[PDB]
Structure formats: structure tokens, C-alpha cells
Amino acid sequence: MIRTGTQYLESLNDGRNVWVGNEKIDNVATHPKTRDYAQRHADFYDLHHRPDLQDVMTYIDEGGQRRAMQWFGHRDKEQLRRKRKYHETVMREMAGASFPRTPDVNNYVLTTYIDDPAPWETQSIGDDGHIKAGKIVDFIRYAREHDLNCAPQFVDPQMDRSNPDAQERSPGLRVVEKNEKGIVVNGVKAIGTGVAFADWIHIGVFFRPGIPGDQVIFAATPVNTPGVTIVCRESLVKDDKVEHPLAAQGDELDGMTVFENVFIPWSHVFHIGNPNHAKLYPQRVFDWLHYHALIRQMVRAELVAGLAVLITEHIGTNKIPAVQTRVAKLIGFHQAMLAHLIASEELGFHTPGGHYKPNILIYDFGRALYLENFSQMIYELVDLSGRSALIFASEDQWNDDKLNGWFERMNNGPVGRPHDRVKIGRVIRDLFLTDWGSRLVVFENFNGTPLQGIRMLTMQRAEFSGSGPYGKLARQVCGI
Amino acid sequence: MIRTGTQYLESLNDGRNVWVGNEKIDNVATHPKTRDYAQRHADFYDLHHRPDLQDVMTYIDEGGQRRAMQWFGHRDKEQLRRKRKYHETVMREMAGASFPRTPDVNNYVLTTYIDDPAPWETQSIGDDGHIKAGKIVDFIRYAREHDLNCAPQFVDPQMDRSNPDAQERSPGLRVVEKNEKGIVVNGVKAIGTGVAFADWIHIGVFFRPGIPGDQVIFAATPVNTPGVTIVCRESLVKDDKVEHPLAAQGDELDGMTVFENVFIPWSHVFHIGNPNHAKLYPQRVFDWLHYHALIRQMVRAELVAGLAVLITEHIGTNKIPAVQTRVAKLIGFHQAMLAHLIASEELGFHTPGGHYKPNILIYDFGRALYLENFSQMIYELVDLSGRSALIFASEDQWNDDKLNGWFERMNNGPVGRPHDRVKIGRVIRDLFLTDWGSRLVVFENFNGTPLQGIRMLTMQRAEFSGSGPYGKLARQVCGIDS
Amino acid sequence: MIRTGTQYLESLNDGRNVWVGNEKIDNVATHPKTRDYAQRHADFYDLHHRPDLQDVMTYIDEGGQRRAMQWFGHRDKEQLRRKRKYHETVMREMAGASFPRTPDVNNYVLTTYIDDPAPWETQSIGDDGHIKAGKIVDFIRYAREHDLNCAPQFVDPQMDRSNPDAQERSPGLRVVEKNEKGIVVNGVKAIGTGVAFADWIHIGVFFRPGIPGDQVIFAATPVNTPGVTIVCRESLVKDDKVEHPLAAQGDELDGMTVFENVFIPWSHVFHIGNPNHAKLYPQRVFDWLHYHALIRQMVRAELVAGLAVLITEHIGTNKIPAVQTRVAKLIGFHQAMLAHLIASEELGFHTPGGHYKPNILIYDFGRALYLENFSQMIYELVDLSGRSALIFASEDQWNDDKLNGWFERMNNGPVGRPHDRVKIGRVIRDLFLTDWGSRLVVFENFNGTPLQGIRMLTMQRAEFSGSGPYGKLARQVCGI
Amino acid sequence: MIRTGTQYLESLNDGRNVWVGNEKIDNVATHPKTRDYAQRHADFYDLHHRPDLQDVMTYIDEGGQRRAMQWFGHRDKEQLRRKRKYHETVMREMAGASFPRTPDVNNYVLTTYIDDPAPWETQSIGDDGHIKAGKIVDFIRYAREHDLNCAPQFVDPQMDRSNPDAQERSPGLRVVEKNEKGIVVNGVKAIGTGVAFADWIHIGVFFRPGIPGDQVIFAATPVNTPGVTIVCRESLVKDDKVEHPLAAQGDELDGMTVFENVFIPWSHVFHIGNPNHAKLYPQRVFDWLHYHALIRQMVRAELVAGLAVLITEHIGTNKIPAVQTRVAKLIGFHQAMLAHLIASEELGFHTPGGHYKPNILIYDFGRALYLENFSQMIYELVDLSGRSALIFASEDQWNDDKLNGWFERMNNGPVGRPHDRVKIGRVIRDLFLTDWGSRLVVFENFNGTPLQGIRMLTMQRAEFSGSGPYGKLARQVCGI
Ligand SMILES: Cc1cc2c(cc1C)N(C[C@H](O)[C@H](O)[C@H](O)COP(=O)(O)OP(=O)(O)OC[C@H]1O[C@@H](n3cnc4c(N)ncnc43)[C@H](O)[C@@H]1O)c1[nH]c(=O)[nH]c(=O)c1N2
Ligand SMILES: Cc1cc2c(cc1C)N(C[C@H](O)[C@H](O)[C@H](O)COP(=O)(O)OP(=O)(O)OC[C@H]1O[C@@H](n3cnc4c(N)ncnc43)[C@H](O)[C@@H]1O)c1[nH]c(=O)[nH]c(=O)c1N2
Ligand SMILES: O=[N+]([O-])c1ccc(O)cc1
Ligand SMILES: O=[N+]([O-])c1ccc(O)cc1
């Protein structure tokens, strides 16, 4: 049976060691700084039990068990679109894609292991044959069985970008002890999203020139593993849900994980020791976060275009021709994201293990296109609003016997409903003019590497050549 | 048979009255200023007789007749993809999409009439029951039977944009007589591409506020109709095909058409008199040419990105990290044009007559995306080339006993083949640094309306509202009633 | 003598009727939500008593009295640059232009009345000869004598932009009674910055098609005038000045002003009744704010560029060639703002009253250049920082016995000083990733009209003609 | 006496060895592919004899000799503005800066040698003391006395950018012999503008990593020197001055210069042998070109803004609110170019020999801002024009008895003067839609290095650091 939100909230009180800013958290489920986002994860579990949402949110496995669609493997295009429809519905149900690391996103990358588990084993170095491909699949099947949230921590510390030789002093997680039972790791996974809210840490690494084998670690450990400390930025959750209808729903915390001589049994180790394996295989893990990112980009673009339509109608600028072509840019951006999502699904291919994967070039350049344009799209939405994005009644001002009459008249545009402008303003302010909204903009910018990173890695991986089928047309037109 | 290139060249010498700059043209087929682009249209006809392309270029109709795919109707997605592959093959064969108004593009717009002819008739005003839906279909079948090129002239004179009342004085084509046999028209179809190379003129209008009813004319007349004069800009064809391998292939002339009391029989009149009809129906005619524009935008973006890969490889900048992220911009643009074309095909719908149409929002916003970015993408290609885009040996300089050794060494980059940098330069120069090239850029910018018009017209036609689909998620998030 | 901060804070306890969000404010000088920005105005007054700053902050008037430079009139280029060095020093001393409506800015616009007071009187309609030019000059000499902060409220309600016929239903402030003693005004000045912190409201209006005579009001009244209510957005001030060294310094509130049958004596009315007068004259009042905006833009661009130099040096990206050209964008933007400032001062002209005014075209197109670019410049600073702009230790995380050694290694870039990355993070985050910093971005975007309005008003006022000296070069090249 | 156009044309027939595309040129003065641009240089000389221009075009030296202002040294801001007015007048008189390498531009860079000749001598390696500062001054005085055009050729071959080793296989000009009379140079100066039209070649080089001593050459040699071959791109001059009123005026040819064992006496060698000397000193020579570029940029932007004003008035779009804000962008761009020119003049400094040099950062960042925006500004001008930029009557079509009536009515917008739209179209088409105009855009893009190069080279030269006066405001705000 599928986990409930109540079971998830109970499970959070497991002794995990967690800083949120200056404070220690006794219980992530109940602490003021964490309880609203924890309840957003609780809401995610409870969506799967809804009889009205069952056909979208669940599937019947070959054994006849109803399971959550976060565990659904896609082997053709129809099945990919069914998975995409699930992810899309989850983000619409949760404050218009305002919580981008729900468990469905975290656990999606596990499919790279399921698809082709052998290389993780065969390419391992210094494990003395202890790592079994069979044991990776058994862990992922365990996660599925208990609807466990595995939060992915791969990225390096941002220590010193001047040196290629600065991966020896780096506090990056290292294997300090290999024995008969497992590994002992010491150091830091420098960055992760929502680990304080997860069940297990999915530990990984990306290749950087000169990475030592003792820092090449793929594994899983519980969030309450002795020697694990979760260290998070201050919570940006807001007290008043009337003034802050989105930001009061909770803050998806980011931070680092300190490992103090942490023991991981070989059963929960996926791969150690091979920098060459860390070149391509970790990209294949993160490809699924990258495809999902496009589903989010389409939904964010749709929300932004909708808010521009609502605000320009409510202040009455929507028929001004020069405003009409500015709304067109925000609508065209949404259509562009939609087009990349649909085309990447059309031009997909089968992986080694028979999973259907969307076209890498289309979704990854679709991500570059979003990051290139998104700050300008935020500028357009806010600029189109005028003052209505920020200078609007608080609720007790609106309802005051003296002020009400003035506010109703000041907000009386062509689609009447004066208070609706305050509702639009609250959402624009929360999304784009609060620390809470700013974190999400920063998250979109970095989580999948920033623009100059997406372009570089996309070119390195594609290995585009004048002699390859790109330059076919150019060579023919040139007489070459 | 399908018409041949040589039949086309013979057909051109039909007494049509043609200016090309300061010169009159005796025979468009043979005149130095026109014969090259005439030969590109002959090449287009001859692609349909190439045995290795038979399956891409022709189909068998329900009567067992092999015909040019330019006449093929698409009723599902599979059929639309076979028509797109035909258009794409034509532009790839024809100098990397350097000739955007070959007959397959011109004739594509006629499918709107074939799909739903009746409203052209029913909505006409003042024709006294003479216009017949069946006669529109009969003309379009006659064009198909003879593989005739119907060049579309719709757009108004650019006279005075200050006030709609100024259209009182507009020299735009007007009905000046209606009789039992047909109409007489007098004035100008102010702008058209390739009319000097076509068989028939396809006349129409777009609504602009205060367009006079006497200027709402949809019809067809031969290019050599008595009273018609074709008046074209100067030809930009280049003499030396070694130095200009693209611009020596000919210049797709644009210009205006003068109609002096031209008689058109009712049989060749599709619609008169109704400004309301000219709002939605002409946009449905040009939908097919906007979809085709997406195919051209993909192929052109592919060419630019390819040229950027070739020149950065040859001068040896391609592994410099800063240059690599700039080439990724050009490749990403191509991938975005690819995404819009595929997505528009996937999200299409059936027209009232059962034709499958690609998604209007996607191809039109894709066109807007292209016009917004293309100037910057040409800058990038030229800027990535450095001096190699412009400052290179002429062929006699290259082959000189004294200069060859210096040129060979000056062009000796990581992929050897020194003379190849000149081959790449020639193409970059022709496309983006000659009059011939700039005309194509200006064509792409204006032919399907410019960026601000694309945006205006797409919004007006779509009428997106807070209470429609674009408001649903925002209304939910804001807690606003549906 | 020149007002002190202590006198200012004492003067706020005057009965003024003030909302800040859902709360009524007992005393703007002492209330938790207002006291910090009130102390920022007190610091402003105190800067004029600092002996090392006397030459820059004060001048000796013809009477031999020392006065604040906010009262200095400039009749030549040298005098303009001396005024500009004062404004520049104020915003540098006050958190790098983080408080853009200090009294020196508010009061700057009064110079337009001083330069040529008569037309305000003579072009008035319906005042029965009660309005006197000498009284306008007397009010402004009174503000000077007492160092009074006159907050300008001119802009209309954002009610309904669909209609030029909106002006009929406008809750905009209107004259409801005229008698022998003065006018009674009823309705709203819909938007103003810092009015809760000012002494007087400078009332005025901009022309709009069909503006009725009864809404053409230029006047001044105390903030504590009976029937005046100040209604402000919620305060964005932060409690912890270690985590938030800028946002803890106070929030420059924006809001509206309600007038309920408010009496203004004729002596404090500058002009009523003439729509035509409201076309060009209000633009001449606000010219001084537009010139001043170029000084702030320069200082803001210099801060952004410097923050980019500091963070790229500290994370070790400053010598990566592709980062060096990005940093060059931010520096070039600063030089562009400096270039417009200096050029506006060089190409100035004398007004009717003999004041020296900088080049309108250079400073207004300068403001347009700033709003076209600033969003992308912030995107660039944040993007250049990577995670360091958001994910950094709180102070108690930093100093913890366990986490300190990890934090010090993770922040050990090429210029040592690990903790300085947290220092730089905190400023980037206050400025562009908090509620507080976002208000300043929105203020900059709208206070002097947004980009499309700057362009439209500049073109409308300039009346550029093909036949004018503008197009002479084009005419000669064309042979027209 | 100042040189005349006639003396200059006479001097071109001196046996210089010139390719223009596939053709050898008997005489640059009279050949169809060269005579028009040679006549533009003749017009340059003849401008200095127009009695109405003598005050702008000439000055009286200490001796009492009247000379061309191209030889005027500026020792203060007032003298610099006088030199700028000269350069501005030349480019306004000559088809609105369509001919950017007139002799006044070429010869401006000689001022760096005059200001401080000693270092060129003292830093020379391997010349055995034969190079003398006095001879450098003697050559530049000889150029002045005879009004000689010294065309600068510094930039390297663009052979292979992948390799720093690339400097050994380089066909770049190298010293193959040194004797007691002078040097023999063999190789290529790979790029120059207008050398076929010049009197002398001014040879220089810029530093690149691993440049050998034997390629560090600064010298002067006649264009007709035995063993010099000038190899030019094909000429883009147009035949019909009515259809092409700018492109028929001549094509400013670009090309390479071949040296086969060319002898240069020590008397005309400025420096050899020191790669370190080639780091900063060549940048000081080209500074004057970079400042001059800012004058051209202002004139070009003024021409583009004027054409937009002219064409929008003629077609009747000039009052459409949405077009009005587009034209504001082009006018804004001109004002920005004006601001940088003026500010650079205002914020200049004295060189070691006491010449006044304008602010390097402002003029080099001004060039960056121009190259970043120019392509968008061309797009806007062409887009604002509609078909009128390209599709217009030829003169014989216009004057045809049948076609005239139709063309008059088609071009009868709100300011009448139908044929004037053709006059405007012809200039837009020549500048931005011909071979000839595109060469000028390309020239503007590359001649002072392209955008990414300006940014990289300006940052490397400035040595901006967080601890420097740059980062003072940011350090203060951060509490560092
Ligand atoms: C809010 C949030 C949330 C998450 C994460 C980040 C953030 C901000 N991350 C980590 C994230 O992927 C990481 O921040 C980005 O890859 C960017 O890396 P750095 O922050 O180290 O900047 P970095 O120092 O790499 O880059 C900083 C700037 O310099 C530029 N630059 C750096 N080197 C360059 C070069 N050689 N050439 C050109 N330009 C260069 C970059 O392009 C960028 O603009 C993460 N990770 C994870 O594994 N799991 C997670 O759940 C999350 N979640
Ligand atoms: C933070 C802050 C602080 C202040 C102020 C605002 C704000 C936000 N203001 C008022 C400020 O000047 C005002 O917000 C701007 O001029 C914008 O006016 P609206 O808010 O009504 O937008 P408005 O409704 O005018 O504009 C909305 C958007 O639509 C566009 N648009 C509207 N009409 C258009 C048209 N006809 N053509 C094309 N585009 C059009 C605008 O360009 C903009 O993008 C103010 N005022 C004051 O007097 N004293 C003060 O101290 C302050 N302080
Ligand atoms: O100008 N503005 O108001 C803006 C611009 C960008 C942004 O992210 C937020 C607000
Ligand atoms: O090649 N270079 O280093 C150059 C070239 C031209 C210039 O104006 C400055 C520097």
C-alpha cells in the first residue's frame, strides 16, 4: 500500500541532526521553520490516495499492486507522456510548480541505475568485488516498496575555481576506510535541496579534471545515519498566509551534508574509485532531472503568462496595442517551452535496458533557452503590473471602514472585482519580490548548472564536428 | 507528364510586360538579369523527373496519375510530414534554402480555398450571384493539371500609416466596373515576390482598419494579361560564380504589379466586397506559408550553425571554451526551430474540409522567435569568423605563382585544407555580406509580416483572456473565480 | 542652525495617522517597523554636523548663515558639480544608495518653483486671485529655514488604463470647496515614498487627457494635517543585522495618502484648475529627480560591478577568460552611467530664473539605458557568484566547533579570508534576493516612470522632427 | 604649403604593385575599381583648401606655417576638442563617416611616437644602437611636411588560434637580415585598410604569447618599395550614382601586404626585437584610433537615428505610440555615444610628453557598448522602414510616363514629397543592404578588435582588483 502523509510526518522524527540557520530542529515535522514544507511533502503522499486523481497519480504493477507513478518506468513515448502528465499534475497541485524537489523529482534519477546497473559494478576500483549490480536494483526496489524519498547530492564544494589542482585540499566526501562490511566516508556533500525532508541521501559525484578515486563515491545512506549533519540556510517561510498565500506554504530548504566517519555497508554502495566512470554515467543519472526541468519551465512560463494576462486585464492595459505585443512575448515563451517538451518526447530513443528517453539535445537547449530569457520574462511581468505588483492594500487596510471605499475605487478596473487585483499582486510579489520567490529563481538558475555550464557540457557531450551530420548542409553549400 | 524545366523556360516568352530596374525584359527565360533565377525554377520542375527523388517529389492520385507533391493534400499528421519532407528536400537541393518562393510555396496557399470554398462565394458583396465556389475549385484544379505557378500578391501599398482615413487616396487595386461578364480592376498590387517568373497572379487582401470595400478583391489572372505591368527592383545576380557561388545562381526579384483597367471574368473571381470576410479568411490562406516558413527557418538555422562549426574548426577557435559556448547559441537556435516545427505537426487539428493543419500558435510564435533572434545569430556567425568572412583571396590571387605560398600558409589551420577557408568565406559573404544575401534577410523579416505585426496579429486572432485557457493556472494560484 | 537627527525624531511624535500593513503606528520614531528608517533620516541630518564632511555637506549663504547643501541652488556647471558631490556623498554614506528618498532628493524638486514662481499663479483657474507667487517662494524659504522634508506625491491612481474617460470616476484628490481662507481637498494621492517619515506633503499632478480642473492641485500640507491618513505597505526591515547587514537598517516605506475634507490655506496652494499648466510644468519639477537618478544609477552600477570583482576574486573565477569578459559587462555599465552623468553636466543650459540645469536628453536616455539593462546586470552578478549568493553559513553555523573547520575549508579561495565570502554573500542577498532589496529594484523601475514611459514622454516633450537640427546629417546624406 | 587632391592623385602613379581581386592595377588614380575612393582621398586633401573651413581644417604652427589639423598635437582638453571637431567635420563632409580610414585617422597614431620616442630606441634588442629616437621624430616630421598618409598594419595572420606554438610557423613579417644600413624583412602584414591609396606603410605588431624577437618590428616603408605587393579584396564600388548615391563614391579597399626581402634603412626602423615592449607600447599607438572610433560611432548613430526619424515621418508611422518608443531606442543610442565622447574628453590625463589623452576606460567601454548594440540598431532602422528600405522605384521607373502616377501616389505619405522616400531608401539600402555597406559594418566590428577582444584587452590592461579604488564602495558596504 502507498505511503500516507501521516506516515511520512511520523517518520521525520527519527533523530536526524539538522541546522536551519542558527537553530537546531528537534522534529522537522513540527518545528515552525520546517513544518509547512514537511506538510507539502505530506500533501504529495496524500495526492496518491485521492480517488478523483488515482488514474493520473497511480498504476497497477504486473503483480496487481497499486503503486505511485513516481516509480513508473517508461519504455515507449505513450508511457513517457503518462509519466510527464503525472509530474505536470503534481506541480499544478503544489502552488504552480513552486516546490521543484518533491519526491517524484528526487527519485526519477534512480531509473538510470535500474536501466543498466552492471557498469556501476564492473567499472568499480578498490571494492575487492564487494559491489553487486544486483544490490543497487535491490535498494531501488526497497525505495519503491516503502515510497522512500532519495535526495540527490552530487555537486562539489565551491572552494577555488582558479586551480585545476584544488581537488586534493577539497573537503569533498572521501572514502577513508574500506573493510569487509563496507566503506567509511568523511567530508561534505556541499550542496543539496530538501535533504532535511528526505528518507535517504543519494550520494554521487561529477567528473572534474584530476578528481582522486577516493572522492568517486556513489551510494545511499539514511538522513539520520550516525555522523550525518544536515546544515540548511535560514527558512524563508512567512507567518501570514493571507498576505503571502505561497510563501506561507513553506520553504524548500537547501544546504550541505557533513559526513563524520560515516559507515555505509557494501549493499548500499553503487560505485567507488573510477574517475573515468564519473565522466558520462552521472550525466545519465541527471538527464531525468533535466527532462523534468522542462516540464517545470513550461508550467512556470504558463503561470507567468497567465499572471500578465490577469494583471493587464485588471488594470485595463490589455487592449493597448503596445502592451498586447509585450504580453505576446510571455505567451511566446510558454509556447517555446511547450514546443521543446513535445519535440523532445517525439525525437526520443531507447536506452541499453529498453527505457524510452526524450531527445537530450532538445530538452538541454530548451533549458539553456529558459535560463537565457527567464530574468527578462520576470522583468516583463513586474513592469507590466506597474505599482500593483508591490503597493497594494494589506487585508486589514482593505476591510477598514475608512480605507475600504478608497481601495475598492482605486482597484475598480474594467473586469470589476476590485479585491482580485490584490490577489494577483500577492502572487506576483511572493513569486518574484520576496526572499522565498528569489530562492526559487536562484534554484532554477543553478540546480541543473547555470547557462554557461549547460552550453559547455552540452557541446562537450555532443562532440559536434564539421565532418559529422551537423555540418552536412554547410559542407554541401560550400562545395566541400 | 509533370511539367519540365524546358517547357517552363519556353512558357516565360509570352509577351509579359516586365521592368527590372531601368530595363524592360524581352524574355525572362534568357535576359542576363533574370535567366539564372528562371533556371532555378526550371531546376525546381526538373527535380520532379529525377528518378532517385521520385518518392519524395511525386505521388499517385486516386485516378493513377503521378503528380508533383506541390499539389498533394494532407488529411493527417503522416501526410503533413510527407509534404514537409517534400518542401525541405526542395529547399536543401536549391542552395540551402536561398530561394524561398519556389512554386511549391506559392501554390501551397490555394489549399485553403479547396478545403472550404463556399464562404468566399456566400460572403461576397455586390457580385449579383456571379461568383461560384465551384469555379474557385475549377481554377485550382486547372493550376494543378498544368503545374502552374500562382504568385500571391495580397499586401497593400505602404502609402500613409498615420490614419485609416488616408486609404481614401490609396492606389491599391480597386473594382472600377462590374458587368454580366466580370469585373474591371485598376491600380496596384504593391508588392509580390517572383511574379516575373510565375504563370498566374493570385490576388487578395488582408484587413487593415478602414480598408475600402472596392479594394476587397480575391482573384487570379495570367502574368501576361493585357493591362498588367510587372515592375521589379534591380537584379543582384553576380557575374563570377567562383567568387559568388550562391549569388551567381540568380536573384528572386520582388516588385509591384500595375493593373490598368484589367478585365477578370467572374470564373476567375473568388470573392469581392466584404471587409469582414478579409479578417479571418486571408490569414487561413497564409497559414500554410507561415508553416512553410518554420521549415525554412530550421534549414537556415542549420546552415548558420553548420557554417559556425566549419569556420571555427578551420581557423582553430572551436576548442576555445568561450567560442564553444557561442557556437552552442547557434546550435540551440537551430534546435529551437526544430522543436517548433515538430511540436506544431504533433499538435495539429482538422479544418472544416478535413485537411490536417499544424498548430498555429506554435508555428507563428516560432516565426516571432526567429525574427527576434536572426540578426543577432548573423552577427554571431560573422563575429566568430573574424576577417575570414570578408578578407580572403580571389581565385586568381590564390593561384598566383607568388601569392599562393603565402595564402596556403595563412589558411593552414588545424584541419589543413587551406583553400576550404575560402570556400566557407564565399558562402558566409554571399549569405550575409552582399546585396543578394541582404535581400533574403529582408525577405525573411517582412514577407510573413515583421515581428511586431506577427505578435499583434497572433494575439488579435487568438483573443487570449483571463477567463480562457491562459488564465486557468494563474486564476487557481491567485484564488480567483473561474 | 541646521536641524539635528534628535530634533527630527522628536518632531515625528505629532499625532500623524499612519498604517504600516495591518498595524497603526503610535510613533514613527520608536515603532519596531519604522524606527530603523527613521534613524536613517536622523543619520542624514547628523551627516551635516560631521566636521570632516562640512565642506561637502554645507555652504555659507549670502547672509553668512551655514545651511545644508540640500538647499543650495546651482547657477553654473561648477555649482551643479558641487550639488552632485553632496547627493553622491549622502547615498555613499547611506548603505550605497540603498535609501533613495532621503530629504535632499525630496526637496530638490522645489528649485523649479524658486526659478520661476509666477506662471503657477497666473495660469491658475478658479482661485479668485488668492494664489500668490510670493507665497510659493515664502513656503519654500520656510522649508529651508527649518530643514523640512517635503515628500512629493504627484502620480495618479492606477484605476483603469482602458479609458481616457476614467478621469470622471477617479478617487484622485479633488477640490470640494473654495472659500476666502483656502481649499478643502478630498480623496487620495495614490502613491508616495517615505511620507510617514516626512514633515510636509508636496502635492502635485501630471496631465492626463480629460483631467478635470478640480483634480489639478499643487500644494503643501503637514503630514499630521487633520483628515490625512498615511497607508503604507508592510515593513521589510529584518531583525538580525548580522545575517542582513543592509535590510536591518530599515525599510523606506511606500504607500498612499487619504485626504478626508482636508483644509489647505491659500498661502500653501501653488496652483489650481489649469490642465494645460499640468503638461510641461510638472515635468520641470521632476527634471531634478531624473538628474538625481543618474547619480544613484552610477553609484548602484559601481556597487554591482565591485560586488562582481569581490565575489569572482574570492571563489577564484576572476582569471577565467570567459568570466573576465562577463565582469567587463558590469564595469562597462558603470562607466556608461558615469559617462551620462558627466556629459549631462557638461551640456547643460540656463533656465528662465538663471539656474543651471543638466542636459535633459542625456539624463532621460541615461535612465532609459539603466532600466533596459539593470535586470540583466543583477542576473549577471548573481550568476557570477554561483551558490555563494544564497547558500552560505549563518553566523552561528560558521562559529560552531564542528562546522567551523568545514566552512573555513569550503571558503578557502585564492585571497584567503574565508569568512569574507559570507560578508559578500550577505550584501548580494540583501540587495537582490530579499523582499527589502526587491522593493529598491521596483522603486528604481517605477518611481520616475518605467522604460516605455521614459521613452514615450522623452519623445513627446522633445518633438524631434525630420526638418529639425536632429536629422540635418541624414538630410544632407540623402540629398534632401 | 598644404598638399592638394591633384598632387595626391599624381603621386599614386608610382609603380606600386596592387591586386584588386583578380586584377592588377596600372594606376590606382585612374583604374575603374579604385579611382572613386582615390578621389575621396583627393577630396580629403582639398577640404583643407576650402576658405569657409580653414579655421576648422588648419592651424598655424609655432613657425607661422599653416598646416592640416591632422598634424595638430593636443596638450589640453580645449586642444583635444578642437582636434575632435576637425575629425567630426571630415567624416560629416565625407558621406557621413562612410570612409573611416581617411589620412587624418591613419596618421593620428603617429602622436604616440612624437610624445615619447626614447623608449622605442632604448628598449630595441639586436639593432646594435642603429635605431635613434631622433630618426623616429624626423620621419614623422617628414610625413607632416609632405602631408603623407601612413597606413597602419599591425595585426597578425589569422592562421591557427588553437596553438600558442603557432608563432614559429607564422608567415608574419620577420627580420631575415640586419647589416649596418638597415633590415631586410620577409613575410606578410596580413591585414590593412586603404594601403593601395596611402604614401607609406606604418608597420607594427601587438604582443601575443611566444612571439619571437625577429617578428617584433615597428618601421615605415613606401607603398611602392621594391618587393612590396598590395593584395586587395574585390572592389564593391557601384556604377550608377543615382541608384547608389553612397556606394558609387568608392570602396575603401582592405587587404594584405606581401614583403619579399624588403630593405628598410635604420633611419625608418622605430623598434625591433623586444616582445615585452610590444605589450603596452602598441596599445598606446592604437589608443588614438580607439578615441577616434568614438567620434565615428557618434556620427554613425546620429545618421541611423536621423534615417529612422526621416523614414517614419515619410511613411506616416512617426506618431504611432509603439513606433515612437522604437525610434527612442535609436536616438537613445546616439545620446549614449555622445555621452561617452564628451565624458572621455572631460576625464582625460597628460601623457609623459605632455599630450592630453581622453579617458581610456570610457572610450574603450564606449566601443564595447557600440559593437554590442549596433546590429540590433541596424535591424530596428530596417524594420521601422518596412519595404521602403529595399523595394522602391529605380529612377527610370519613377520618371516613366505610365509608372510615375502610381509611384507618386504610393509614396504620398503625410509630408508629401513622394520622391524623397526613394532618396531615403537609397541611403538605407547602400548603408545596410549592399556589399559596400556590409564591408563598413564588418570594418567597424573588427578594425579595433571585436567585442570579446575589447572586453578581454581592456580588463587585462586596467588590472582591476577588489583591493583597488574600483572595489572601495563594495568593500565598505560588505564591511571587509
Ligand atoms: C538553490 C540551489 C539548489 C541546489 C544546488 C544549487 C543551488 C544554488 N545544487 C548545486 C548546483 O548544481 C551548483 O550550484 C551549480 O552547478 C553551479 O555551481 P557553483 O555554485 O559551484 O558555481 P561555479 O563556481 O561553478 O560557477 C559560478 C559562475 O562562474 C562561471 N564559471 C565557473 N567556471 C567557469 C569556467 N571554467 N568557464 C566559464 N565560466 C565559468 C559559471 O558559469 C557561473 O556563472 C545542487 N546540487 C546537487 O547536486 N543536488 C542539489 O539538489 C542541488 N540543489
Ligand atoms: C515603489 C514606487 C515608489 C513610487 C511610485 C511607484 C512605485 C512603484 N510612484 C508612482 C510611479 O511613478 C508609477 O508607479 C509609475 O509611473 C508607473 O505608473 P503605474 O504604476 O500606474 O503603471 P501604469 O498603469 O501606468 O503602467 C503599467 C505598465 O503598462 C505600461 N503602459 C501603460 N500605459 C501604456 C501606454 N499607453 N502605452 C504603452 N505602455 C503602457 C507601462 O509602461 C507599464 O509597463 C511615485 N509617484 C509619486 O508621485 N511620488 C512617489 O514618491 C512615488 N514613489
Ligand atoms: O524592474 N523590476 O521591477 C524587476 C526586474 C527584475 C526582477 O527580477 C524583479 C523586478
Ligand atoms: O590585435 N590586437 O591586439 C589589436 C588590434 C587592433 C586594435 O585596435 C587593438 C588591439
Author numbering:
A (entry chain B), C (entry chain A), D (entry chain C): 1 to 480
B (entry chain D): 1 to 482
Authors' description from the paper:
HadA is a flavin-dependent monooxygenase catalyzing hydroxylation plus dehalogenation/denitration, which is useful for biodetoxification and biodetection. HadA belongs to the class D two-component flavin-dependent monooxygenases, which use reduced FAD (FADH–) as a substrate. The initial and committing step of the had pathway catalyzed by HadA monooxygenase is hydroxylation with removal of either halide substituents (F, Cl, Br, or I) from HPs or a nitro group (-NO2) from NP. Each protomer is composed of three domains: the N-terminal domain (residues 1–146), the β-sheet domain (residues 147–275), and the C-terminal domain (residues 276–517).
